[PDB]
Amino acid sequence: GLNLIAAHSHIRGLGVDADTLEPRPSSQGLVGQEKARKAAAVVLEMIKQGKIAGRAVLIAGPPSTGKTAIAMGMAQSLGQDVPFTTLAASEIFSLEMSKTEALTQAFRKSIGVRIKEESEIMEGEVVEIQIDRSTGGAKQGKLTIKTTDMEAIYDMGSKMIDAMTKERVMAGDIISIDKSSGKITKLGRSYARSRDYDAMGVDTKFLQCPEGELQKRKEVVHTVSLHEIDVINSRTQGFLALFSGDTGEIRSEIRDQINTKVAEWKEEGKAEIVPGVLFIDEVHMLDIECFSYINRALESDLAPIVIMASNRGVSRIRGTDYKSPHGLPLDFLDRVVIINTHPYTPDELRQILSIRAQEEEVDLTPDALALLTKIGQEAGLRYASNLITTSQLIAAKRRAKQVGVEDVQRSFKLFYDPARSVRFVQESEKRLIGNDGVVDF
Amino acid sequence: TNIESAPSLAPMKHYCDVTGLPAPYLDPKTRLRYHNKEIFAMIRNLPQGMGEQFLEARGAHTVLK
Numbered sequence: 219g220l221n222l223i224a225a226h227s228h229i230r231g232l233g234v235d236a237d238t239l240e241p242r243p244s245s246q247g248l249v250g251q252e253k254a255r256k257a258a259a260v261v262l263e264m265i266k267q268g269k270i271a272g273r274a275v276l277i278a279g280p281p282s283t284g285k286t287a288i289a290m291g292m293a294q295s296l297g298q299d300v301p302f303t304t305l306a307a308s309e310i311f312s313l314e315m316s317k318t319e320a321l322t323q324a325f326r327k328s329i330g331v332r333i334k335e336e337s338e339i340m341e342g343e344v345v346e347i348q349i350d351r352s353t354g355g356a357k358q359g360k361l362t363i364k365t366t367d368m369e370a371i372y373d374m375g376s377k378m379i380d381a382m383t384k385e386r387v388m389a390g391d392i393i394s395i396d397k398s399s400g401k402i403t404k405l406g407r408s409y410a411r412s413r414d415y416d417a418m419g420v421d422t423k424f425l426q427c428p429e430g431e432l433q434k435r436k437e438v439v440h441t442v443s444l445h446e447i448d449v450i451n452s453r454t455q456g457f458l459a460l461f462s463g464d465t466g467e468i469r470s471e472i473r474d475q476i477n478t479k480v481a482e483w484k485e486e487g488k489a490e491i492v493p494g495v496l497f498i499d500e501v502h503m504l505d506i507e508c509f510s511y512i513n514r515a516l517e518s519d520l521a522p523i524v525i526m527a528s529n530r531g532v533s534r535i536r537g538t539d540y541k542s543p544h545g546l547p548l549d550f551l552d553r554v555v556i557i558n559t560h561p562y563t564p565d566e567l568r569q570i571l572s573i574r575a576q577e578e579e580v581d582l583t584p585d586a587l588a589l590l591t592k593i594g595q596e597a598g599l600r601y602a603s604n605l606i607t608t609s610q611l612i613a614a615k616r617r618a619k620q621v622g623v624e625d626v627q628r629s630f631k632l633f634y635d636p637a638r639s640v641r642f643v644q645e646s647e648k649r650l651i652g653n654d655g656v657v658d659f
Numbered sequence: 660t661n662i663e664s665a666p667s668l669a670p671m672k673h674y675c676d677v678t679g680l681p682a683p684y685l686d687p688k689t690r691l692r693y694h695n696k697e698i699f700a701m702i703r704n705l706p707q708g709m710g711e712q713f714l715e716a717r718g719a720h721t722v723l724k
């Protein structure tokens with residue numbers, strides 16, 4: 219149920235030690251990369267500190283050397299506390315709005331405000347409801363409820379009886395009357411009145427009575443970013459825009475006033491600012507018009523730390539014509555700090571394939587694992603990690619239990635690795651459309 | 660003369676009548692304001708003849724005739 223095995227469903231954190239920052243070589247999924255994971259650990263421990271600006275760390279490296287893996291490790295090693303936002307750098311080139319402003323919203327999405335305030339709620343099974351609608355109306359009525367411990371009678375206002383016939387509270391429901399507003403969230407049905415429910419399904423869940431007192435205060439903690447407040451204070455009922463993307467060019471005075479009230483909330487002690495992480499995946503797909511704004515959005519007090527990943531070597535910058543390292547201009551490479559990765563040794567390839575095999579729960583003989591490591595030496599991690607999922611299914615064709623050499627050699631036979639595909643293109647020139655010609659036998 | 664005593668008409672803050680703490684909810688069996696579940700336990704296992712004396716101390720006992 220919505221936990222389908224992806225290409226990164228085996229990473230359960232960054233995996234490094236949190237006491238001496240030592241990258242232990244096999245923990246929580248990330249296996250093999252040492253120096254880059256220690257530098258990511260240092261960056262991660264200065265994110266949770268909070269006493270630094272929005273800085274820029276560039277995870278540069280060759281393809282399939284674990285860059286999205288390190289970013290997802292830092293995403294899993296923070297929990298749902300500090301806001302992590304992914305941004306593949308082609309969501310910026312929109313048509314609903316401009317391009318620099320679409321980047322500004324992605325900066326504002328990663329600066330949370332965390333405020334904690336209390337509510338008063340009521341648990342409990344309804345014993346019975348009597349409503350004095352007799353021609354009368356919703357004027358007076360009695361509500362008898364109980365927990366396992368308590369039991370009580372309440373009288374109701376008119377604007378509560380109009381919420382009781384609104385949710386249709388039966389004799390046996392497990393409701394949560396939020397006292398400060400009046401909404402009723404039925405948590406379920408009580409088991410002891412299972413006879414008293416006729417208009418339900420044959421398969422219907424039933425709960426027990428709530429345990430404890432019947433009138434308690436909850437300290438809920440909410441955390442919303444500054445872009446949330448910006449989109450809220452933009453129309454009449456404008457929060458729908460951030461669920462439908464129909465927000466446009468937000469005027470800058472609104473952002474300035476909200477940057478003032480967040481500081482006034484912090485100085486009164488009513489609030490607390492949490493700087494998040496913004497991960498700009500594939501940062502080489504930005505033109506120089508973006509870098510001339512990231513060079514100055516990383517200057518203010520309210521700026522999240524930017525982590526970004528580049529594949530290209532000496533390549534061209536979009537918008538302009540002159541080449542540069544990593545596809546980035548040099549005045550922006552002065553800002554960033556670069557972490558370089560390395561290709562993988564074959565034993566690390568073998569144990570990464572072992573983790574990817576244990577994640578999908580596929581049994582492997584060690585001979586097939588040796589053959590698969592030999593393939594991954596010559597065709598990369600992605601090809602072998604797909605040959606695993608193919609070979610399990612090919613073993614399931616002929617009703618086998620463990621995969622073997624006779625199935626990896628079929629998966630290697632049907633599905634070409636991209637090197638042999640490049641050889642296929644080079645040896646089938648005259649029929650494949652290069653630029654001009656089509657020859658038909 | 661002697662009919663100058665005046666009643667009231669205002670919302671009253673109802674307190675507990677077992678203890679003196681502020682109590683927000685009563686009972687169906689004995690109609691006692693009570694603070695929490697310990698006082699509810701001591702209400703539902705008290706010996707008979709006293710659950711009416713609490714309403715006697717608060718007033719409106721309504722003893723039989």
Ligand SMILES: Nc1ncnc2c1ncn2[C@@H]1O[C@H](COP(=O)(O)OP(=O)(O)O)[C@@H](O)[C@H]1O
Pocket residue numbers: 225226247248249250251280281282283284285286287288570573599600
């Ligand atoms: N240290 C590691 N531990 C486990 N799996 C890894 C590690 N490094 C890379 N991988 C795997 O290799 C694949 C390529 O990593 P990824 O970061 O997606 O490559 P790229 O940097 O080209 O995006 C990923 O699917 C990931 O599962």
